[PDB]
Design a protein around this nucleic acid. Structure first.
Length: 51
DNA sequence: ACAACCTCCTTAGTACATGCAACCATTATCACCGCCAGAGGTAAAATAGTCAACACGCACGGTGTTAGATATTTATCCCTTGCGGTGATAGATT
């Protein structure tokens, strides 16, 4: 599961093709997800975003 | 006939390795003093010379003027700043 398996739900370049995520094994297998992405320029903890 | 063995005898052979700092004393003991050496002293003359005299003659340095350089002043010029517009990067793909 790879960059060649993405779809662009927004404005996103991808200078990370080699970032393989996971795998599948059968001729009828599947997996799907959404992903949220951000740029900003500073840091906050995942469970101290607070408001 | 000797052999080593029992006992405490004494002897004496050794005592690991790397490095830095400190300074170099104690003795008493007649060396006599007699002789004379070449050998210390110094007067007078060799191996040769001083420095004062009157000359000789020159260099150097300080006072003076000149020279020109320099550091200032002025003002010019360019290279740089910072922001901005929008650049073909980085690098993923063909």
């Amino acid at each position: 599961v790879t960059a060649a398996d993405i779809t662009h739900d927004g404005d996103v370049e991808i200078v990370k093709p080699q970032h393989v995520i996971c795998h599948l094994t059968d001729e009828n297998a599947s997996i799907s997800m959404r992903i949220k992405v951000q740029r900003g320029r500073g840091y906050v903890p995942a469970s101290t975003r607070i408001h």
